[PDB]
Design a protein around this nucleic acid. Structure first.
Ligand code: APC
Ligand code: APC
Ligand code: LYS
Ligand code: LYS
Ligand code: MG
Ligand code: MG
Ligand code: MG
Ligand code: MG
Ligand code: NA
Lengths: 506, 505
RNA sequence: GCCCGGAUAGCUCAGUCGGUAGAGCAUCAGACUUUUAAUCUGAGGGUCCAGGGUUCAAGUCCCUGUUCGGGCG
């Protein structure tokens, strides 16, 4: 009965504990790794038996074929590689020990094997064991699922099962670790200093993202989880550390969907005496070098709609394409839009609304010019942003805390990097004017309150730091999870997360 | 006066903004950093003037002094280095520009200087400016005083002021970052894989502490802040990743003092097919390497009650000492303590309490066996732990996640590294038995129901993961903040934290 | 809420027009000293989603109820 298998196995294990045959030994001295074993002894001719070499490996059994009463084949699997184990009685310690150990071994059990390298008559590298030791029995029936596990409910809720049964998961996570390591090395070589900013803030801020509210009993007050390390990074830049960076975890009290998580890892750096046009080249170098170092080339194949969907071949050649929002939008829509200075005026908002309705671009119930123009951009600019593209200048109406344009007016100093019709990186030229910063904070706090008592959603510590002099600096941020999704060919954020947050059962 | 100065400076800046003359320019191309400026143009002899080189640097005006109406020395400050912008009328663009820019710049203002490197008669490197541009005025008055500011509240609440006025803070933070960089390099070269475990868990667990409770809105469940990534790391090792590690943040809902913070960073790794004696050599190598790579030697001087206090000279020579927590306690105390290897009855607790009374020590009001024996070991085996020292094994009752000792009973496979009488890292041989782990979880839950706020709950997902088979593993955890405190001669956790949590005053 | 189609061993499907529960996979036992998704030999495992009427006899004729899935709101 498959349902009672666990119980039966448990009983057997209990018996092994009763009669002094503890199936959980404290230590097994593994001499060589499976990868090193395979690399070293792959040259052996078929039929070889290195009787003069003794090695101790360890791994989980993934198969068990009984070709006879004295000849059994196991398939150790570990470190992403497999190794056959040719349990033969004539090469074992004794026949009784052989049958005793082989009567207690099942699939999924973690065992240690001591024996001699060799190759079968079919040219399969294996290890003839002098003695097999049981290290950790598997009490649950491990399925023999050909083509791997495919149910996307035990894959995410039981990540260990996904790792055991599916091999691409390990590669997906190794790629993410390599991505983070490459970013760290790049920024450190550039001269940056990695910092750790508080994840719990007294104030939530004026941002629209919903925060996570905790309660500190010792200090008898509420604590808000981090949304961005923005303000503390800028306070450090005020202090004197010109170049800072942090790869950290931000929290958001929003919904859980295909491409969202309550907690996510983002990279953010800030450098003094620069601007967004200076960060353009740094972003080009970082992204192109990361792609070259991870995938081994500048071309990446991505499937936005699963393996059966369309395949897109993006090219990360270092000269990324750069386009301005206003000019490219003029070229795409054909018609010219009113001048930027009149972006705040209502007639601009209405002429944008009329033309977007003419193009059937659905917008949220708030019909402010910001929503309309960002929808226009997303519907007629990101559509063509398959290869990485640099949107070069955005209007001030979506962008607070960013300096005004050097020559233009009403346009913020920002760029965005779009790969596969999705933004991965953004950067801004900082607003170091304490008066303008305070005015924006007040306005956004009043907007966030939306008729409430207000007098909050601000950081008087930050507005006091800026009054001490913040050098003209530039900030850059990027989503780690989206980059990992684009580099591991995953269209779901849960595929690049070890333990994604899932809805509770029942 | 500071309010008056702020009012006057703000009025002046507003008047400047009215008639053009933006005091916040968008871009200033810094050609060479200050450190490179000192490194390169230091071979000059006093009285040299490289009129054929023009460089644009930037910094903050720490001090502005004038010697005559046509000669004024500013003291630029940058990445921990000090320049000296010696500005004069003859080599400036114009005299009118000279006195128009001299009456506007004050202390603390961030400026950019485009000029020729040189050296005066006295012999300190300077830059003769052709044009000075104000980049960011400092509205408030920087407190001008020697030795920096000593007000701990001001330094901790306003870290930017501490960085501006005090230089050793930058050194402390550089050292703290180098610690984490070296740990990552050491673990990566050993084959470990860096991972990111969730910071919010449905049920509390991971380590003995009190958690932070949140409330997800869309999904109606109550989330809990992380205390340790231990369980997730062990499930990942079950999955097949032999070696994992993570340098992350843990949250405690407890008090704040000189050594405790609500959020703190710790490094945890787990390696399969290893025991707690396989991590002692690794720990020796990692700690000695960190000390030698940062300090430059194996000898470190530490002041535990302030620099004015006595200095203790610890030595990090790789052969660290090794001590047994029960055997050496027996040797030093004098008498035979209760056997406790197979005796966990109330008699053991009572005789422990009698020993505590006889030894003149203070014990927690719960007076339980674990707390007692913890007081006994801490007060009798820790005074002579100046140099780094290992603790071979600890009784099982203070070990709900460590495998039992292979030879002795009641003891567990658990060592602890102590430097300067404080634990930095501790490692376990992890318990891979599902039945024993379930039993220990049940005891912890029963203790919590009995009124133990520091007990964990039972996690059935981890129990199932163990039921699927966990290899013989060893786990290791280290407190980064305490190590940074030791390596920076800092006796307060606030000194090694960028923005420590303080009273809402 | 209305209509339609399934409710069958542990899982996936036959069971045809009733003459009765079968096949594969999963588990257990046996055979085989060179397998690789090893292969053969069997065993257990259901009570046919539930209750009624037709029929000598109905999972396999029909009517209700429960659930799931799809469409229609
Ligand atoms: N749930 C989530 N998971 C991961 N990253 C998230 C996230 N929510 C926000 N972000 C970050 O925010 C960036 C831009 O999104 P934001 O405008 O800040 C919030 P959003 O509106 O929910 O996302 P969207 O604009 O991508 O639709 C992303 O690239 C990512 O870095
Ligand atoms: N609130 C906190 N702030 C900073 N570091 C903390 C901390 N709580 C624990 N740590 C660190 O976590 C590591 C292990 O701490 P523990 O030994 O579990 C503390 P404890 O013994 O439970 O309580 P105690 O610190 O009040 O004696 C050490 O590096 C310690 O400094
Ligand atoms: N936090 C910002 C940096 C720019 C800040 C501009 N005031 C980002 O990641 O985009
Ligand atoms: N990381 C835990 C325990 C370390 C040993 C884990 N096997 C702690 O510091 O408390
Ligand atoms: Mg956007
Ligand atoms: Mg982004
Ligand atoms: Mg301790
Ligand atoms: Mg510790
Ligand atoms: Na069969």
């Amino acid at each position: 009965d498959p349902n009672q298998y666990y119980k039966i196995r448990s009983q057997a294990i209990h018996q092994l504990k009763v009669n002094g045959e503890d199936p959980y030994p404290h230590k097994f001295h593994v001499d060589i790794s499976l990868t090193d074993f395979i690399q070293k002894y792959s040259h052996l001719q078929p039929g070889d038996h290195l009787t003069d070499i003794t090695l101790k490996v360890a791994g989980r059994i993934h198969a068990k074929r009984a070709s006879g009463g004295k000849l059994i084949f196991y398939d150790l699997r570990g470190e992403g590689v497999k190794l056959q184990v040719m349990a033969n009685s004539r090469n074992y310690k004794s026949e009784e020990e052989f049958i005793h150990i082989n009567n207690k071994l099942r699939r999924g059990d973690i065992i240690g094997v001591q024996g001699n390298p060799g190759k079968t008559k079919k040219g399969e590298l294996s290890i003839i064991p002098y003695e097999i030791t049981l290290l950790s029995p598997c009490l649950h029936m491990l399925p023999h699922l050909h083509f791997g596990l495919k149910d996307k409910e035990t894959r995410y809720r039981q990540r260990y099962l996904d790792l055991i049964l599916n091999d691409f998961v390990r590669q997906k996570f190794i790629i993410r670790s390599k991505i983070i390591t490459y970013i760290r090395s790049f920024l450190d070589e550039l001269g940056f200093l990695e910092i750790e900013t508080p994840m719990m803030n007294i104030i939530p801020g004026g941002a629209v993202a919903k925060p996570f509210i905790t309660y500190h009993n010792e200090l008898d007050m509420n604590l808000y989880m981090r949304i961005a390390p923005e303000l503390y990074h800028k306070m450090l830049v005020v202090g004197g550390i010109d170049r800072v960076y942090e790869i950290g975890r931000q929290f958001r009290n929003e919904g859980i969907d295909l491409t969202h998580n309550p907690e996510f890892t983002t990279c953010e750096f800030y450098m003094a005496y620069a601007d967004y046009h200076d960060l353009m080249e740094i972003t080009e170098k970082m992204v192109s070098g990361m792609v070259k170092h991870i995938t081994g080339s500048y071309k990446v194949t991505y499937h936005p709609d699963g393996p059966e969907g369309q395949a897109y071949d993006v090219d990360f050649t270092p000269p990324f394409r750069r386009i301005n929002m206003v000019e490219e939008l003029e070229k795409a829509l054909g018609m010219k839009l009113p001048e930027t200075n009149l972006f705040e005026t209502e007639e601009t908002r209405k002429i944008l609304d009329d033309i977007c309705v003419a193009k059937a671009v659905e917008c949220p119930p708030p019909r402010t010019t910001a929503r309309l123009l960002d929808k226009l951009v997303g519907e007629f600019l990101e559509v063509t942003c398959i290869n990485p593209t640099f949107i070069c200048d955005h209007p001030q109406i979506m962008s607070p805390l960013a300096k005004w344009h050097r020559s233009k007016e009403g346009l913020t100093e920002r760029f965005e990097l779009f790969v596969m019709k999705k933004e991965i990186c953004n950067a801004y030229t900082e607003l170091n004017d304490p008066m303008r910063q305070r005015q924006l904070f007040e306005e956004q706090a009043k907007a966030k309150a939306a008729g409430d008592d207000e007098a909050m959603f601000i950081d008087e510590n930050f507005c006091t730091a800026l009054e001490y002099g913040l050098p003209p600096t530039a900030g850059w941020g990027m989503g780690i999870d989206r980059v990992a999704m684009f580099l591991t060919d995953s269209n779901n954020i849960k595929e690049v997360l070890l333990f994604p947050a899932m809805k509770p059962e029942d």
